[PDB]
């Protein structure tokens, strides 16, 4: 659980005095980070019967060659780097926009594993 | 002083027994799922598996919970809880599978049968 | 007591006749059974079949509004008309 309601001052620093409680629709879940392990997923429910698939661990990827446009599933070994956080590279976290290392070759994750339910990585040219 | 309830699966017949003394002390410590010799019941080779219990104040034992004492449980379903509303959680008082001197009733079932009849081996 | 009838629309969706008339009574406002007995002869409707919903008398002048109705079946009346109307309308031999 996290609160994603509109609570960060107004424009100036005058502390916004809340007139409403923490509503149910403003409650966001936890960042279920993904690592390189046994491929584990959970069918967490969301609004309107939309069970969003959340991934937690994975050592395989759907590496997509751009030269020929062929999709083959190759194992994930290590995150090469990541622009979003300099610590996920050390933690082997698999976020979107990171760069993983597969058997096919180095690839960049182009899918959000916490929302997509799979690790779809485009093979870097 | 245990007020044991024993049921027969072959006829769906439950015999209520009032037991005391050394046999009651033998029943103490026997967790849920234990098998007990019929000499504690006097039955000719009838072995009973204990599958329940409750306190003097009506608190029901739980086979799930390990430990003899009481615990507070915020459950949403299971043994000894009925949801008044659909998917409602409550904090009841349950017991472990361990048998205690503050336990009255011991529900159990007949498993390993004996030579004689079940009824006639208790004077009936 | 006198009666003149103006509107006799028949509802095709229920097979009943809507009786609208002006009650030219004198003095004492007639009861529902009496107005039914008078309104029966105007359109050939039995007491069990002819039904009246109000004989509402206005101020001053002795004129009343009569919203009576006619059915081709008493079971249809019991299925459609409310129970207070069935009690309020005395059947032949009713108590």
């Amino acid at each position: 659980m996290r609160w994603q309601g509109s609570s960060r001052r107004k424009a100036t620093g005058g502390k916004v005095i809340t007139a409403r409680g923490k509503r149910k629709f403003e409650m966001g879940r936890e960042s279920a980070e993904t690592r390189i392990s046994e491929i584990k997923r959970k069918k967490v429910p969301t609004m309107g019967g939309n069970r969003k698939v959340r991934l937690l661990q994975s050592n395989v990827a759907n590496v997509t060659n751009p030269k020929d446009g062929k999709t083959v599933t190759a194992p994930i070994e290590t995150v090469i780097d990541n622009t979003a956080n300099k610590h996920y590279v050390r933690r082997n976290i698999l976020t979107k926009g990171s760069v993983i290392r597969t058997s096919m070759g180095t690839a960049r994750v182009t899918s959000r594993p916490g929302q997509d339910g799979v690790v779809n990585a485009v093979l870097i040219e | 002083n245990f007020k044991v309830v024993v049921s027969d699966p072959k006829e769906g017949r439950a015999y209520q027994i009032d037991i005391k003394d050394a046999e009651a002390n033998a029943l103490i410590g026997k967790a849920i799922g234990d098998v007990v010799d019929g000499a504690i019941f006097g039955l000719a080779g009838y072995k009973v598996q204990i599958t329940g219990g409750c306190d003097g104040s009506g608190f029901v034992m739980k086979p799930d919970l390990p430990g003899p004492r009481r615990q507070r449980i915020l459950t949403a379903t299971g043994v000894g809880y009925v949801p008044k509303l659909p998917g409602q959680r409550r904090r009841k008082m349950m017991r472990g599978k361990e048998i205690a001197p503050d336990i009255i009733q011991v529900n159990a079932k007949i498993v390993e049968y004996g030579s004689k009849s079940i009824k006639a081996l208790l004077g009936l | 007591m006198d009666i003149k009838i103006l509107k006799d629309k028949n509802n095709s969706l229920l097979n009943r006749r809507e009786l609208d008339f002006v009650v030219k009574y004198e003095g004492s406002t007639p009861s529902r059974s009496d107005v039914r007995n008078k309104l029966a002869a105007m359109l050939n409707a039995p007491l069990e079949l002819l039904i009246i919903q109000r004989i509402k008398t206005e101020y001053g002048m002795q004129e009343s509004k009569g919203y009576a109705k006619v059915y081709a079946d008493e079971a249809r009346m019991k299925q459609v008309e409310q129970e207070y109307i069935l009690k309020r309308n005395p059947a032949p031999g009713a108590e």
């Binding site: - | - | 509802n11 095709s12 969706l13 229920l14």
Partner: protein, 234 residues
């Protein structure tokens, strides 16, 4: 899902008498703004049943049909140009918007008559289908001849196409809002004025003016193809 006596919609001609709620219309296919309950229609306009229970009885017994569909619910919405058919008297009525934006009923002559609809968004269902954002009846998932706002006409109750009433310059047009509601007249110029809100249209019937493209109905080639105006019975 309630609505009160005071906050009854502007398109609802029925007054502000009674006690709070007046017959909450369902979600339905049509907009709730231009909608009246079938129970309110049969209890106020036509006057075939006076109570709500008797209205629910007559609806439930398959006695009233809305484009050949005998709806048993008294909360069904009704949109503009909707036909109500009663076979027992041959009473045909059409939902119409008068000059004040309110919804009324005009009686028709024949029981069997078409119904007019409109195109609002042509999307593509997977399977090579040009979905027209239909909401009522059956239709034809057609081709690019069927454009937006084309105002299709379809039969009843089978709801097959009768004639593609495509609009052009000079063709007929009926207003569906504003202060010009019900002033049907020929189209003068349908200008595709680019802007962030929506485009515009030029229409002149008895008197010329400018009107919005969401307040125009392509109701005929030169003359009324559908039975637009019959008898305005309350």
């Amino acid at each position: 899902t309630h609505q009160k006596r005071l906050s009854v919609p502007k398109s609802w001609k029925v007054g502000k008498k009674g006690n709070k709620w007046i017959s909450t219309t369902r979600p339905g296919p049509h907009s709730q703004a231009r909608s009246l309950p079938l129970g309110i229609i049969i209890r106020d306009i036509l006057k075939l049943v006076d109570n709500s229970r008797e209205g629910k009885r007559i609806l439930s017994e398959g006695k009233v049909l809305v484009d050949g569909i005998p709806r048993k619910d008294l909360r069904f919405p009704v949109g503009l140009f909707d036909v109500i058919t009663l076979p027992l008297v041959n009473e045909a009525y059409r939902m119409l918007q008068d000059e004040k934006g309110r919804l009324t009923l005009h009686k028709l002559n024949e029981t069997n008559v078409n119904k007019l609809c409109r195109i609002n968004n042509k999307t593509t269902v997977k399977g090579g289908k040009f979905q027209l954002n239909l909401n009522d009846g059956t239709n034809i998932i057609g081709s690019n001849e069927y454009g937006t706002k084309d105002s299709l006409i379809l039969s009843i109750p089978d709801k097959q196409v009768v004639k593609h009433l495509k609009f052009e310059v000079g063709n007929l047009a009926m207003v569906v809002g504003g202060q010009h509601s019900g002033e049907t007249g020929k189209i003068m110029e349908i200008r595709e004025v680019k802007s962030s809100r929506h485009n515009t249209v030029m229409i002149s019937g008895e008197t010329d003016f400018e009107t919005i493209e969401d307040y125009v109905i392509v109701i005929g080639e030169d003359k009324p193809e559908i039975r637009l105006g019959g008898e305005i019975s309350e």
